[PDB]
Amino acid sequence: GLMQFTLPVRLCKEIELFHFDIGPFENMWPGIFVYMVHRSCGTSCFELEKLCRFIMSVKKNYRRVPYHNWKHAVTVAHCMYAILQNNHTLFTDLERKGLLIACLCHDLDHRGFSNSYLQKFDHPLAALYSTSTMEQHHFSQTVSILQLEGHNIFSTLSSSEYEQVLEIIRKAIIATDLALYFGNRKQLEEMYQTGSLNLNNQSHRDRVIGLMMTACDLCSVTKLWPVTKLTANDIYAEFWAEGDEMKKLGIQPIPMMDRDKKDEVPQGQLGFYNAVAIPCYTTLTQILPPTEPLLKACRDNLSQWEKVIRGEE
């Protein structure tokens, strides 16, 4: 019972920073996640046997796609850990429990295609879930794994607390639908500016948690430039494969997804930082000030993308 997870000195130190990379050793990631859950939640929170059983089942249900894989899950969860550690007096016991799990499960069974491809292909999931197609499937997959024998990590929780944690996980996994981000950030920016933003209001808390979810999901843009540069290849590998699949459906894909337009990537990445990433980290920083290193790191990679266009690399 008195077992504590201990990371090697370098990892132990670096894991507390927003720009930490979990490395290339697959086998260390479950230990990295368990360590994060113990420092963020406590050794008590989950039964180590149930938690490790749940982690392996979640890993098992993540596909071998270039980007939206198991490594993405553990990275998105790490970024959440970094946020929760720099704002620990702001989150409930249940929120700390649910958010690291939601991040771990957020892209469960992701096939590497967007909601648009699912919609255009007429995939069964698009008939089952009209909007936030994959995100509703990811939550559905999270519940399926929680219902497996010996996998209920929230067994100790009351009937009411279990329904609260599951609702935190649901809202958070749906929030990773980038289509919803735009309106959520606009509503949060307005509430913050008119001083009406109250963290005691549950609907306001839901919105802030949604913004934290977009921030972690896009945390690839907040790492040191070599990590960002290499992660962009994986992101575009999926994009180009979906572009190829749109062409198979007889639909010319958007240039972002066209592998014949690889030369337009630095300009498209510049557009992404301006339209999505910088607004996301700016509003997040106004709301939760210790998350400033995410915005700082993001602005540095935006500058690196400008250097790419200018022929500086």
Ligand SMILES: COc1cccc2nc(Cl)c(C)nc12
């Ligand atoms: C055009 O670039 C993009 C489009 C949509 C989502 C994206 N997510 C990430 Cl994290 C990055 C680095 N780029 C994105």
Ligand SMILES: [Mg+2]
């Ligand atoms: Mg998503």
Ligand SMILES: [Zn+2]
């Ligand atoms: Zn994701």
